[PDB]
Amino acid sequence: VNSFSGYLKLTDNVYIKNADIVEEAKKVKPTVVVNAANVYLKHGGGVAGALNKATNNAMQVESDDYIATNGPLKVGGSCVLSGHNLAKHCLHVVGPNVNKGEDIQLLKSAYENFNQHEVLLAPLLSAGIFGADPIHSLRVCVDTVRTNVYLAVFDKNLYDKLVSSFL
Ligand SMILES: CN(Cc1nnc2c(=O)[nH]ccn12)c1ccc2nccnc2n1
Numbered sequence: 037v038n039s040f041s042g043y044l045k046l047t048d049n050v051y052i053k054n055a056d057i058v059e060e061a062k063k064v065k066p067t068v069v070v071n072a073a074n075v076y077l078k079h080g081g082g083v084a085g086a087l088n089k090a091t092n093n094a095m096q097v098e099s100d101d102y103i104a105t106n107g108p109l110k111v112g113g114s115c116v117l118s119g120h121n122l123a124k125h126c127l128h129v130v131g132p133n134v135n136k137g138e139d140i141q142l143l144k145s146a147y148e149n150f151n152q153h154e155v156l157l158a159p160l161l162s163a164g165i166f167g168a169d170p171i172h173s174l175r176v177c178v179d180t181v182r183t184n185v186y187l188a189v190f191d192k193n194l195y196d197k198l199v200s201s202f203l
Pocket residue numbers: 159160162163164165166167168169170188189190191194
């Protein structure tokens with residue numbers, strides 16, 4: 037038993053809710069919140085900008101030190117950093133950005149990072165300003181992640197389309 041509430045169950049291990057991931061994180065304090073990161077950990081907009089703003093920019097400060105030491109992430113890769121006031125840990129995961137021409141096949145590699153964590157609160161990777169089809173992203177999530185994932189979808193309209201079209 038865990039503290040996630042109001043989710044619809046899509047499969048054995050994948051759950052979904054119309055929710056703002058920032059508010060959901062502050063209420064649940066999950067062990068892991070996933071950020072929709074870029075390789076530079078520049079949290080300017082989308083989910084990343086929202087999460088970083090909620091940390092009063094502490095996420096960005098920590099991220100800049102990480103990059104200065106380690107260099108950029110790979111598309112499809114991840115790193116574990118602090119969750120600040122939102123979660124114990126933040127798993128920064130880089131899905132391909134279609135608006136940068138990155139290969140959509142890397143979306144599966146991106147979701148494989150979730151399997152290193154037993155339970156996660158996450159957004160749909162490569163959705164939103166990353167330009168992928170969220171229905172495709174949900175399909176890859178379900179077909180790749182084997183650990184317990186709680187997907188927060190900010191847009192109610194999109195949430196309804198995702199549920200109603202789910203096979
Ligand atoms: C309504 N939105 C934005 C949005 N608002 N909240 C969320 C969320 O929570 N996850 C992902 C997206 N998203 C759309 C709609 C069509 C899209 N078609 C292709 C890529 N992105 C798209 N985004």
